[PDB]
Amino acid sequence: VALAIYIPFPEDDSNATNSNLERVEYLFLIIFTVEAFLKVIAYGLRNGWNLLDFIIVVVGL
Amino acid sequence: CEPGAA
Amino acid sequence: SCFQHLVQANVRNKKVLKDAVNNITAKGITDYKKGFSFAFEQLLNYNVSRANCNKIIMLFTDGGEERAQEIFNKYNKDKKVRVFTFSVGQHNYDRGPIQWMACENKGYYYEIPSIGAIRINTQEYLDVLGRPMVLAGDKAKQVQWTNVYLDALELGLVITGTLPVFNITGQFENKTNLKNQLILGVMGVDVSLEDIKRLTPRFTLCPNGYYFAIDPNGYVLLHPNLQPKPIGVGIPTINSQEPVTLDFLDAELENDIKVEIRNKMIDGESGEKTFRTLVKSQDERYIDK
Amino acid sequence: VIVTTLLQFMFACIGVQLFKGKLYTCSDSSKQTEAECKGNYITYKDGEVDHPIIQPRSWENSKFDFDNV
Amino acid sequence: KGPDVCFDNNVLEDYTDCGGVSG
Amino acid sequence: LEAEKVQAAHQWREDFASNEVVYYNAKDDEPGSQRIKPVFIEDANFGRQISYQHAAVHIPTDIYEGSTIVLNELNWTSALDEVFKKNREEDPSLLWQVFGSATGLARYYPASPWVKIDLYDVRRRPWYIQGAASP
Amino acid sequence: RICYIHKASLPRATKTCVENTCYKMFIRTQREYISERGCGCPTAMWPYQTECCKGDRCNK
Ligand SMILES: *[C@@H]1O[C@H](CO)[C@@H](O[C@@H]2O[C@H](CO)[C@@H](O[C@@H]3O[C@H](CO)[C@@H](O[C@@H]4O[C@H](CO)[C@@H](O)[C@H](O)[C@H]4NC(C)=O)[C@H](O)[C@H]3NC(C)=O)[C@H](O)[C@H]2NC(C)=O)[C@H](O)[C@H]1NC(C)=O
Ligand SMILES: *[C@@H]1O[C@H](CO)[C@@H](O[C@@H]2O[C@H](CO)[C@@H](O[C@@H]3O[C@H](CO)[C@@H](O)[C@H](O)[C@H]3NC(C)=O)[C@H](O)[C@H]2NC(C)=O)[C@H](O)[C@H]1NC(C)=O
Numbered sequence A: 001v002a003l004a005i006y007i008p009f010p011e012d013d014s015n016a017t018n019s020n021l022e023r024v025e026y027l028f029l030i031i032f033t034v035e036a037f038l039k040v041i042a043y044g045l046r047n048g049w050n051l052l053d054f055i056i057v058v059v060g061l
Numbered sequence B: 001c002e003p004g005a006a
Numbered sequence C: 001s002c003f004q005h006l007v008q009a010n011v012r013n014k015k016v017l018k019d020a021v022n023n024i025t026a027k028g029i030t031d032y033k034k035g036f037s038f039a040f041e042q043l044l045n046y047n048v049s050r051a052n053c054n055k056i057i058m059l060f061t062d063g064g065e066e067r068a069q070e071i072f073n074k075y076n077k078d079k080k081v082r083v084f085t086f087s088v089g090q091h092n093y094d095r096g097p098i099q100w101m102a103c104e105n106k107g108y109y110y111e112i113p114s115i116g117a118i119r120i121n122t123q124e125y126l127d128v129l130g131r132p133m134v135l136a137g138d139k140a141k142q143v144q145w146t147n148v149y150l151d152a153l154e155l156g157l158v159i160t161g162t163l164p165v166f167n168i169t170g171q172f173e174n175k176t177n178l179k180n181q182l183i184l185g186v187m188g189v190d191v192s193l194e195d196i197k198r199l200t201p202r203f204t205l206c207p208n209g210y211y212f213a214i215d216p217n218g219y220v221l222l223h224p225n226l227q228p229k230p231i232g233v234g235i236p237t238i239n240s241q242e243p244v245t246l247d248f249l250d251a252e253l254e255n256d257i258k259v260e261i262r263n264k265m266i267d268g269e270s271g272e273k274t275f276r277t278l279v280k281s282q283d284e285r286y287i288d289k
Numbered sequence D: 001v002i003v004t005t006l007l008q009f010m011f012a013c014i015g016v017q018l019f020k021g022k023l024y025t026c027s028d029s030s031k032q033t034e035a036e037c038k039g040n041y042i043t044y045k046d047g048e049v050d051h052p053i054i055q056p057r058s059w060e061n062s063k064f065d066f067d068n069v
Numbered sequence E: 001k002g003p004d005v006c007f008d009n010n011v012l013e014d015y016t017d018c019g020g021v022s023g
Numbered sequence F: 001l002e003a004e005k006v007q008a009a010h011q012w013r014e015d016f017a018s019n020e021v022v023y024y025n026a027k028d029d030e031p032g033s034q035r036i037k038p039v040f041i042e043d044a045n046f047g048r049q050i051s052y053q054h055a056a057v058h059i060p061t062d063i064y065e066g067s068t069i070v071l072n073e074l075n076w077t078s079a080l081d082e083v084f085k086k087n088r089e090e091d092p093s094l095l096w097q098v099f100g101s102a103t104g105l106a107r108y109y110p111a112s113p114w115v116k117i118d119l120y121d122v123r124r125r126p127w128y129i130q131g132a133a134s135p
Numbered sequence G: 001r002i003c004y005i006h007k008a009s010l011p012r013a014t015k016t017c018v019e020n021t022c023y024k025m026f027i028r029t030q031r032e033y034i035s036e037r038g039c040g041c042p043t044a045m046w047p048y049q050t051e052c053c054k055g056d057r058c059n060k
């Protein structure tokens, strides 16, 4: 839903909502980082969708 | 005056 | 522009400002608080020449969500500076704060959707600006004479009188006052420059003598060097609408003494002066003393 | 086929009470009434302000309207 | 030298005639 | 004064078709408004075909001359022409006398035909803008 | 008073009327050709559009 709201602007413009969603998509990255940190030292990445989650997480950081 | 060129 | 203050709206100063707003590029985030802090601070100089009259700000945006109620409360809290807001273009942004800026600041909200509405919209800020003059009664009915300009119907160089007309229906009871704050129109009677020349006979003088008169601006009303052609603004390039405003100092050769006479004539004094000059010949090839 | 044409009639009936006469437009975008959309107006070729061309003003309905069923 | 007659800031002026609240 | 007093008794009309206003549209070689064919006489002072009987009316291209606002002016801006005449008769040297209305139409006297594309609007002329407001 | 009303748009025959509004029924795209003048201010079927006037033979 955060991505749905985000709305793009021509040539670097931005309103306040885009200046808040970029803050929210740091908690939304810390949550996934915390999730991915426990599974590796709990389940030893080859589950498929787990691999996809890992790629999106590392690209996010 | 007559115009120039550009 | 290259200007950093308020400059007079000449035909030359109005070309530098139309060759720079024809070159701007769009990039970056918008910030109304910084923008309106500049505008309210440029109409506070009083170091340079100013009209010291109607002080308007003419915002040209598309839309936004910032009201800037703080900037409009630090500078413009006595309602001295009007704010006219234009919402130009075809888009979907919230035109809410923009409508609020005009109302709270004694202005008007104008909309320019397409290129066809540009000519009818950017001429109605003279109906808002005419409200303080309509209510003034019969003390604003003063004949004003324009600068020398070429007539629309081809007639030569003319100057025009001016007297506004007031919507005064229902003035017996003075109860409506809903549309009576706008002028019905402005009149005018043209006085051709040739008519003025008949009142200054020159054939009792030698060819070196002549008459000339100037505005309270330096612009000549009649002069032997004033020709019925529009003045130039720069080098032309190929890839009646403007007045013929020719300054006195640019009609003949300029001296240090001639500046003194020009200032005295603008002030409204009387006097005489005798002084050797360099007068350019009619063929623009010789100069004598 | 009969079911499809019945649903066509149904959706036409709903759309009539939704776009009944609201799909009118003028050649000039600054006028929004048939009475006002009259006379002539200025049109600029390729959005160039230096090439004005006079066009008439016409209250034209959409190619595919919804006025009736 | 500019004109000495000026006309602005009158009290009995109806400022409530914008194009967003009255249109 | 005469443009103020006459406007105070216009008696705003709504259907200017049964009763038609007579005016000379300058930009010409329609129901609801009758035109006049003037006589015209080439004259000195001016240089065009001027007519000492009525005043022409210039309405911009993008203003429909049969709207209920334009037609409502042309009815009260018709007692002006009697003051356009007494002014000139007293002083024969009078040049163009024009009334630039806020609705875009200008009624100038003596009547004369207007001068490619036409883009004239009286509300933008320098003699009008300087009188509609202050510096 | 007089505006030609007919069913077949091609011949353009004349019929009397009583309404004080003469209309103009044309196609939405090819508007140069007038399909049906007449009297009154009727409803246009598809593909057609109507412009209504104030007097007789105003449509032209
Ligand atoms: C000088 O000022 C006076 C007032 O100070 C002004 O006279 C007034 O003119 C208006 C014309 O708009 C008259 O309005 C009457 O009442 C309503 C209100 O507008 C009209 O009905 C609708 O009007 C709107 C206008 O936006 C229009 O879009 C709408 O179509 C109209 N409704 C219909 C069904 O068509 C009436 O039509 C109108 N009366 C009549 C008989 O038509 C005011 O009554 C006038 N006030 C007075 C005191 O006479 C005058 O125009 C100003 N002069 C100039 C040159 O502008
Ligand atoms: C606005 O619209 C009309 C277009 O011409 C004009 O209506 C005219 O009103 C006049 C006065 O009401 C009429 O003149 C005569 O007035 C006397 C009163 O002294 C009465 O007898 C009648 O009312 C009237 N007729 C006769 C035969 O005496 C005009 O006849 C009438 N014109 C028309 C065509 O109906 C208005 O004058 C006009 N407003 C302005 C300022 O021109």
Ligand SMILES: *[C@@H]1O[C@H](CO)[C@@H](O[C@@H]2O[C@H](CO)[C@@H](O)[C@H](O)[C@H]2NC(C)=O)[C@H](O)[C@H]1NC(C)=O
Residues within 6 Å of the ligand: C045, C046, C047
């Ligand atoms: C001209 O404007 C400036 C600011 O726009 C005024 O500011 C003064 O600047 C000079 C030197 O920078 C100093 O006098 C002071 O630091 C500033 N303030 C005052 C009150 O002088 C300046 O005063 C203006 N010049 C005038 C009024 O002659």
Ligand SMILES: *[C@@H]1O[C@H](CO)[C@@H](O[C@@H]2O[C@H](CO)[C@@H](O)[C@H](O)[C@H]2NC(C)=O)[C@H](O)[C@H]1NC(C)=O
Residues within 6 Å of the ligand: C254, C255, C256, C278
């Ligand atoms: C016209 O030319 C003369 C001569 O070249 C110039 O006037 C001289 O200017 C210099 C430099 O300011 C002075 O030192 C001389 O005294 C001037 N000569 C005079 C006053 O006779 C100047 O370019 C022009 N003269 C003007 C504008 O008065």
Ligand SMILES: *[C@@H]1O[C@H](CO)[C@@H](O)[C@H](O)[C@H]1NC(C)=O
Residues within 6 Å of the ligand: F090, F091
């Ligand atoms: C107008 O000017 C002329 C000469 O310019 C003068 O004789 C006359 O008295 C002035 N007034 C009138 C009303 O003609």
